Homo-oligomer: A and B are copies of this chain.
Amino acid sequence: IVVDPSSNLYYRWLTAIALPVFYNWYLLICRACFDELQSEYLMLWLVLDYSADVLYVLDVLVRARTGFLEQGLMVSDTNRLWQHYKTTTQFKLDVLSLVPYPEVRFNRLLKFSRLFEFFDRTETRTNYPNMFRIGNLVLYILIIIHWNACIYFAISKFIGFGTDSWVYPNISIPEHGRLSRKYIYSLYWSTLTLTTIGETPPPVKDEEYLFVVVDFLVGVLIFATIVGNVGSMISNMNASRAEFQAKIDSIKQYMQFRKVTKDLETRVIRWFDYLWANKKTVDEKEVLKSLPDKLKAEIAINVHLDTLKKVRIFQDCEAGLLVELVLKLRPTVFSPGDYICKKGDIGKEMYIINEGKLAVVADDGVTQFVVLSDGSYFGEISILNNRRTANIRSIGYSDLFCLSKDDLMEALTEYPEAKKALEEKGRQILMKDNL
């Protein structure tokens, strides 16, 4: 068995190994600093420490039998995998984290790379990355609140319980002697110090003054990091809405600068209203810039074969050549009541309809001669040799696959027989409308 580092078994193991590291950080510093949670839950920490050691040696085994790619191919030679594991420093961290009083078990915190790998794999794999980042930042600040609460209780136990007024009070009193009281008051002191509220009792001794200075500076930097992360997350959450609102406002300011008429500006307002109502904010012409060409071609040929199985006229054509024609096919969306092409207009564009409704009309008269739907096609008699002979309007919000003149010029100057079949269909419909 050789585990693929991009599979789902590897992510299930990253979850199963991110469980005991997140146990280990939290409860090892809590047990080591509190010494009553250790002493009154000893069988539970025996069970959980044995389970964490079992998962740690199982993670040494799984990192021994996982594979890395050389020349794009996964190695399955287990001796090569073991030597590639042994030459790294993660193996040194694992054998330091498995060197057989929780102060001697503080090498178990060294396998933080599995927790960071689990966080990066969940950030790459989940559907709600903003919610995961909220949870991850809350988890990080709770770890620091907890560790500073344990550090405060350790400094209080080192100085003396109830000697000063800054330290934790006398634990011989049965009010401050409870373990829940000890932990939640240390957590409350940690929260007041790290969020820079400062409602704590003031320090007395010089070590207490110095620890509170260092803690307040660390809390100021933690507050600055929280503020920066939540601000960056808010901006990256609403950056798409802000970019389209900036485009909407630049359109509106250009219209009010040029003093365009009221009907056209409310038509532009209605177009933006339709766009935000039907979630068509992102445009394919800028989406398909940043793709590699093979991945740009696969999704394009997928959606275009899916919509080309609805048209049955344009089938007598060569396979990959029709494939590249519908690869270079490009979508636009028309508003209702919009003329695709007028009577006295010369064409340079071919259209393939998908999820629209276009009806042909006469000169300034709304009447449906033949209405074109999903699976129909038009725009072909005035492009291969020169004027559109049919008024065509958009009945509703239609979506047309536009086509440049140079695509049909490329499919004309190289390949004659498929465009001769297309022109024979065009000539038969030409004779049908006016022989």
Q: CB within 8 Å of B: which residues of A?
A: 5-6, 69, 71-74, 120, 123-125, 127, 129, 138, 141-142, 145, 178, 180-181, 184-185, 187-188, 191-192, 195-199, 202-203, 206, 209-210, 212-213, 216-217, 220-221, 223-236, 238-240, 242, 244-258, 260-261, 264, 267-274, 276-280, 282-284, 287-288, 290-295, 298-299, 302-303, 318-321, 324, 332-336, 338-339, 342-346, 355-357, 373-374, 386, 394-399, 414-415
B252/A73 in contact, CB under 8 A: no
- Tell which of B227, B232, B373 touches A238, judged by Cβ atoms closer than 8 Å: B232
Q: Which residues does chain B contribute within 8 Å of A123, judged by CB atoms?
A: 245
- Tell which of B141, B252, B299 touches A264, judged by Cβ atoms closer than 8 Å: B299
- Tell which of B192, B202, B234 touches A232, judged by Cβ atoms closer than 8 Å: B234
A279/B253 in contact, CB under 8 A: yes
How far apart are A135's CB and chain B's nearest CB, in angstroms?
A: 12
How far apart are A124's CB and chain B's nearest CB, in angstroms?
A: 5
How far apart are A279's CB and chain B's nearest CB, in angstroms?
A: 4
- Known contacts: A127-B252, A226-B224, A282-B254. The answer to whether A334 contacts B292 by CB under 8 A is yes
Name 18 extra pairs, CB < 8 A, besides A138-B217, A191-B217, A320-B343: A6-B270, A72-B355, A72-B356, A124-B248, A142-B217, A220-B226, A224-B227, A224-B230, A231-B231, A231-B232, A236-B246, A257-B280, A258-B299, A260-B302, A268-B299, A283-B290, A294-B334, A320-B346
CA distance A339 to B333 in the complex (A): 32
A69/B231 in contact, CB under 8 A: no
Q: How many copies does the complex hold?
A: 3
- Tell which of B127, B229, B343, B357 touches A72, judged by Cβ atoms closer than 8 Å: B357
Q: Which residues does chain B contribute within 8 Å of A414, judged by CB atoms?
A: 346, 386
A212/B188 in contact, CB under 8 A: yes
Q: Which residues does chain B contribute within 8 Å of A72, judged by CB atoms?
A: 336, 355-357, 394-399
CA distance A223 to B120 in the complex (A): 27
B250/A282 in contact, CB under 8 A: yes
- Tell which of B141, B280, B333, B355 touches A217, judged by Cβ atoms closer than 8 Å: B141
Which of A141, A295, A356 neighbours the largest number of chain B CB atoms within 10 Å of its CB?
Answer: A295
CA distance A345 to B233 in the complex (A): 45
B191/A213 in contact, CB under 8 A: yes
A273/B333 in contact, CB under 8 A: no
- Known contacts: A250-B282, A272-B124, A335-B295. The answer to whether A232 contacts B235 by CB under 8 A is yes
- Known contacts: A71-B357, A232-B242, A292-B332. The answer to whether A195 contacts B209 by CB under 8 A is no
B221/A138 in contact, CB under 8 A: yes
B277/A5 in contact, CB under 8 A: yes
- Tell which of B199, B227, B249, B298 touches A227, judged by Cβ atoms closer than 8 Å: B227
The 4 closest A-B pairs by CB, nearest first: A72-B396, A228-B231, A224-B230, A197-B198
B71/A355 in contact, CB under 8 A: yes
